[PDB]
Amino acid sequence: IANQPVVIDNGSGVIKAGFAGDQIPKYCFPNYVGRPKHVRVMAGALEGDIFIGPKAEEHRGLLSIRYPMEHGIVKDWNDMERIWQYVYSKDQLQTFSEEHPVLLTEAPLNPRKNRERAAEVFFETFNVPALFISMQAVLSLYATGRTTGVVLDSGDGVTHAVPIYEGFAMPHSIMRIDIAGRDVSRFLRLYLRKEGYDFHSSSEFEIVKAIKERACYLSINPQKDETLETEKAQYYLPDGSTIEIGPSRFRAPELLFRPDLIGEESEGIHEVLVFAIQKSDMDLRRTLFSNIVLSGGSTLFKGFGDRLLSEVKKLAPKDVKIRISAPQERLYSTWIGGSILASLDTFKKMWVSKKEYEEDGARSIHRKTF
Amino acid sequence: IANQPVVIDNGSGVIKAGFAGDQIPKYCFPNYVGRPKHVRVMAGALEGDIFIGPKAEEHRGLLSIRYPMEHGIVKDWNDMERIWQYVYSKDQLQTFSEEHPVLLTEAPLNPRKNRERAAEVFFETFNVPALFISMQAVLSLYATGRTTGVVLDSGDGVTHAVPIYEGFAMPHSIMRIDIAGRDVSRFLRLYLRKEGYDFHSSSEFEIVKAIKERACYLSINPQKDETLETEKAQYYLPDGSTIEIGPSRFRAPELLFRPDLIGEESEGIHEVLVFAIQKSDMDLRRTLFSNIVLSGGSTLFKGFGDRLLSEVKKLAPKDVKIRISAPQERLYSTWIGGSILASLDTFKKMWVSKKEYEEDGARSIHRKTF
Amino acid sequence: LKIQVHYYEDGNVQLVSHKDVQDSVTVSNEAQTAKEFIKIIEHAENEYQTAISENYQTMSDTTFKALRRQLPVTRTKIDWNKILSYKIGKEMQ
Ligand SMILES: Nc1ncnc2c1ncn2[C@@H]1O[C@H](COP(=O)(O)OP(=O)(O)O)[C@@H](O)[C@H]1O
Ligand SMILES: Nc1ncnc2c1ncn2[C@@H]1O[C@H](COP(=O)(O)OP(=O)(O)O)[C@@H](O)[C@H]1O
Numbered sequence A, B: 001i002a003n004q005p006v007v008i009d010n011g012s013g014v015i016k017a018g019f020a021g022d023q024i025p026k027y028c029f030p031n032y033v034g035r036p037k038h039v040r041v042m043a044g045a046l047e048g049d050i051f052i053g054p055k056a057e058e059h060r061g062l063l064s065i066r067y068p069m070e071h072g073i074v075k076d077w078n079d080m081e082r083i084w085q086y087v088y089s090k091d092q093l094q095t096f097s098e099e100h101p102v103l104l105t106e107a108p109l110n111p112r113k114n115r116e117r118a119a120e121v122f123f124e125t126f127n128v129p130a131l132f133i134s135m136q137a138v139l140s141l142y143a144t145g146r147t148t149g150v151v152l153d154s155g156d157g158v159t160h161a162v163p164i165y166e167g168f169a170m171p172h173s174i175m176r177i178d179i180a181g182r183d184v185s186r187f188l189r190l191y192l193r194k195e196g197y198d199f200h201s202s203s204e205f206e207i208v209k210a211i212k213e214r215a216c217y218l219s220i221n222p223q224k225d226e227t228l229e230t231e232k233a234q235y236y237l238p239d240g241s242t243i244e245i246g247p248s249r250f251r252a253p254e255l256l257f258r259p260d261l262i263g264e265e266s267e268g269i270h271e272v273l274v275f276a277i278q279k280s281d282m283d284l285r286r287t288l289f290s291n292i293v294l295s296g297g298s299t300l301f302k303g304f305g306d307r308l309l310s311e312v313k314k315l316a317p318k319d320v321k322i323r324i325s326a327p328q329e330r331l332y333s334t335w336i337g338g339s340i341l342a343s344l345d346t347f348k349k350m351w352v353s354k355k356e357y358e359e360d361g362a363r364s365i366h367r368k369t370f
Numbered sequence C: 001l002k003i004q005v006h007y008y009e010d011g012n013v014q015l016v017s018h019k020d021v022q023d024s025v026t027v028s029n030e031a032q033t034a035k036e037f038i039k040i041i042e043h044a045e046n047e048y049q050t051a052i053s054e055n056y057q058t059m060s061d062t063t064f065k066a067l068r069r070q071l072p073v074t075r076t077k078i079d080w081n082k083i084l085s086y087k088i089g090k091e092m093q
């Protein structure tokens, strides 16, 4: 027995937290730690060397930004502990961690040590009554309400196509690549450098991320738009200066469909989806093609749906209906799924209890997650 | 022709080649085509856009690798032609295709069109005087000085149990499954991904294959070692860094005895062997159980013999003697058998003339074969 | 054409196959007509036996699959602990 479970979808880009049963995640904030890089000289300056959440965004020019997660894998565990502490602070969730079961999310095919260390942190440092490390794609499909389909979740750190049959994620058909929104923004930074506009600072990488979110689109025909004269839309920087983007506007999100633009010999996002579908059973391929669900932030590019549909039709067999679903709540689909799962009474039978972790350890999460 | 014949064992992973009568093939090289993926900028770069043989291994990181054979079936025929001309190149076996008859070795139960196109390629693109196509398992039994027994040939693409009685392989009792050393390397790549080591590159697949070859073993009891936490053994990558392998050492080759670990609807290798033995009349079964000959590279796993013995004993009838023979020359046993067969003057009556192929066609080469 | 095969080593199997064929010929010479007849016998029986062999080849894939599948549609063995502890998971729709 414990309080209402707390859902924490910890992405590489933004963490989304709330209590189970809420319609949307009420507590969303970027997943980075900001530390001041300048010299504090006077009394009355900003307090604390660690800035997380909207306090980091308000003073963004003052801070060096560090991302703990990279490609869905926690690289700095002290920063991850700080961020999860902030999730429980008086600014977010206003509650003690010793009272609420947690439903953490983890991207598929992650390292085992990542899940083990996450459970160790959540059971030792935060002393949670219970824990359940879920997978993002199956939760997104639960949020959509369907039971069978393919979830092509493309987040900040990792993109992956996961087919689910009657609620069970087929584990031998999961396709994953590490090219995601952060890679697209790094590519955009490189192209802006090739256009004369140079950004170095970790705080200016957030300006590059904003440029990606604001003025970038996917052209239906890359070669046709490539040869034509560009329009050079102008973007207003935070300081008031302007920059003319031009060809970098559409070649930056092209990285999702062509990783070879950065020398990676990995599949494209359309190839990820189609190979996940074609690696599954021959009986399920028709219903998997007829049920494709987009998710994550990187699926919000202008013209993403039409471009992916064209690519999948190019790769898919003929006489097979293709229906890519792009719900409005793509950013919070996986969190809404975690909230739906945690509301059920069956979730009581799913979590690893605190005593179970105390007596077993990593094996408890290893059997219970799978 | 009085000139010496050449035996070519074109396996999926490694292609053995050599003049007949030698006790060993001196010209074995990997069976893939490497093409450079980086852009050449200097005057004096590596000439040529096709890299086969030890040169492809020297410049491995510079190249993208492509395998022409998959599961013993030639998928890319141009690359197969390129490799077969490389067999005659000055680097290895400096000779002419017109001067030497060819003993090609092929996997059993292959499609008709594969043999047809192999004969067409060897007779038209190569002006070969005489071609004979054989099997891989019957030769492997010829190598070990026997004429009755069952050969469990487990190569890179395909693994088959073939019972031979008095030289003539029983075509009806052949058992074949497509999971082989290549599938074990892919499974090891997935598990290494699950330890925090990504090897998505095509050239890093060869490093994963090397890790499979040098650090892997088969546990005697599956669940016993599965539950027990294994010591982390460290392997040195080519760049000089180190990777802790851990449970993936023993989970990877377990695919051979449990194809369902990757969702393949096929029988295990022990089941394949026992079904091959039991598909024959009972009077020969007691002799076949005694005369079991391992063959192919994938049988070289540390502890393969003990686990195969345990599984065959678990499946086979009680009170039946079972003896597994593991020759030291398991990789080259098929080529040794091909050399032995070619050394016989009766081989002079077993090949197909160019006039014979021109007159009859595939009918001649298929009535000459078994 | 009728084929009846029984095999009962530590089990039991009973194949019963039947085929009906209809063809036409032309009667000009008795030896020529007999040769044409035997050629028709050759073609019919060869195609029938090759069809039986092909039907056996496609047994596990399609014909047998209508009764029981080699593996589930998920292509993985059932996790009995999962199905026992957790419900089917199709409560939402
Ligand atoms: N409207 C948009 N257009 C393009 N990219 C976006 C948009 N909104 C968010 N993103 C990108 O999506 C990423 C966040 O996606 P999200 O689903 O939160 O990932 P995660 O699963 O890691 O939480 C950010 O890196 C951001 O760059
Ligand atoms: N010591 C070893 N342990 C495990 N696998 C091995 C070992 N040596 C070779 N192999 C594997 O065996 C395969 C080569 O076997 P081989 O008999 O040459 O196959 P083929 O007949 O298809 O050429 C390679 O893919 C390699 O990974």
Ligand SMILES: [Mg+2]
Pocket: A009, A010, A011, A136, A155, A296, A334
């Ligand atoms: Mg997410």
Ligand SMILES: [Mg+2]
Pocket: B011, B136, B153, B155, B296, B334
């Ligand atoms: Mg071989």
